[PDB]
């Protein structure tokens, strides 16, 4: 169909235009809450680690999709491999609090510690970008912090995720006509 292209009103033609038939679609895998709900690894600091989803690398599935939203909300689960006991403090806590074990402290139990944590920021939602300094995000954009004698692995998992105002999501720029890769296949 033709239309006024200057308008942002979406136009979605279908194959029925030339005699085809539109099929049924099942889009559960592109549901935001479902797709963000899985663990992703970040490289940890030795002891004190601020819980900040922007640490998730931008090329990962979770990191790229998170960056494709401007504002977001979620609760969180973390899985941590650590020596010693692990202490968590909420958003707004003095860093010294990390040495006091009345703050949620999980005693070491092999092979790792998994915890469910609530959102604790003072804002109604957080943002992946913030036009203040025109990089740096306000200090209040975090889910608290953790500390152990040694933290060797740290995974984040967004729960009940909500996203607002989509932003660019980019695939790899290929050099040839098509980006080609080795796909899994039965052997020789």
């Amino acid at each position: 169909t033709t239309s006024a292209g200057e308008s942002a009103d979406p136009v979605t033609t279908t194959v029925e235009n030339y005699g085809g038939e539109t099929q049924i679609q099942r889009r559960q895998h592109t549901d935001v809450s479902f797709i963000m709900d899985r663990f992703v690894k970040v490289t940890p600091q030795n002891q004190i680690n601020i819980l900040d989803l922007m640490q998730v690398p931008s090329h990962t599935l979770v990191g790229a999709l998170l960056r494709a939203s401007t504002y977001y909300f979620s609760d969180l689960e973390i899985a941590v491999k650590h020596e010693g006991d692990l202490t968590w403090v909420p958003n707004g806590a003095p860093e010294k609090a990390l040495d006091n074990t009345t703050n949620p402290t999980a005693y070491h139990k092999a092979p790792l510690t998994r915890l469910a944590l609530p959102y604790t920021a003072p804002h109604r939602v957080l943002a992946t970008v913030y036009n203040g300094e025109c990089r740096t995000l306000p200090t209040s954009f975090n889910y608290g912090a953790i500390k152990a004698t040694r933290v060797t692995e740290l995974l984040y998992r967004m729960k009940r995720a909500e996203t607002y105002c989509p932003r660019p999501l980019l695939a790899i720029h290929p050099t040839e006509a098509r980006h080609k890769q080795k796909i899994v296949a039965p052997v020789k």
Binding site: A4, E6, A8, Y71, C134, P168
Partner: protein
């Protein structure tokens, strides 16, 4: 255009903001971005002390840039909002600590119908800078195109957005108006030689809270 010789029909739109009006005979409609109304204006962060200031809800103007034949795809002009304002809205930012408002934005690029080329105008939240590849997806944001064979005016209306219900505009700018060249300007023999791009903007639903002391 979906209307009917020269710029016409149900393509004539008059917008009124306060005691200021703007009429265009080549409208392509209005793009509402993200919502068609504001969310709650009275929350706990202002303790019922906020008020609306209707006198600030009116059009103010600025020149953006001059579109010339040498500009190529991707050439952009960014305008962070709020911007300098020497009228009533601007004085509010020096009188109250917290504020919120949406924007009613009109961008015009007046050449003639013998020019060719195309501009994309978009309102983008939290935007300081953007990469070249990301420009291919600027249409994810509230936008409208200006294509000389069809129109000279783009109109986008957006609500206040932000991690906070009220803002401190001296340190944060939630919206950035971006105008980008999609296809280079062509002049041929009868087109205008260049096109000056102007913005006519009105703050909407202006609320303020936290009166400041005077400098006295």
């Amino acid at each position: 255009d979906k209307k009917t010789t020269t710029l016409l029909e149900d393509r004539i739109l008059t917008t009124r903001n306060g005691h200021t009006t703007s009429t265009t005979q080549s409208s392509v409609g209005v793009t509402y971005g993200y919502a068609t109304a504001e969310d709650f204006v009275s929350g706990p962060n202002t303790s019922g002390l906020e008020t609306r200031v209707v006198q600030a809800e009116r059009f103010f103007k600025t020149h953006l840039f001059d579109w010339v034949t040498s500009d190529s795809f991707g050439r952009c002009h960014l305008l962070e909002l709020p911007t300098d304002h020497k009228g009533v809205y601007g004085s509010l930012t020096d009188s109250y600590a917290y504020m919120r408002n949406g924007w009613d934005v009109e961008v015009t690029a007046v050449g003639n119908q013998f020019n060719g080329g195309c501009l994309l105008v978009a309102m983008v939240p939290e935007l300081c800078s953007i990469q070249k590849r990301e420009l291919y997806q600027l249409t994810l944001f509230p936008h409208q195109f200006i294509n000389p064979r069809t129109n000279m005016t783009a109109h986008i209306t957006v609500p206040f957005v932000g991690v906070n219900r009220y803002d401190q505009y001296k340190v944060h700018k939630p919206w950035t108006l971006v105008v980008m060249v999609v296809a280079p300007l062509t002049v041929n023999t009868e087109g205008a030689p260049q096109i000056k791009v102007y913005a006519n903007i009105a703050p909407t639903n202006v609320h303020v809270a936290g009166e400041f002391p005077s400098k006295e």
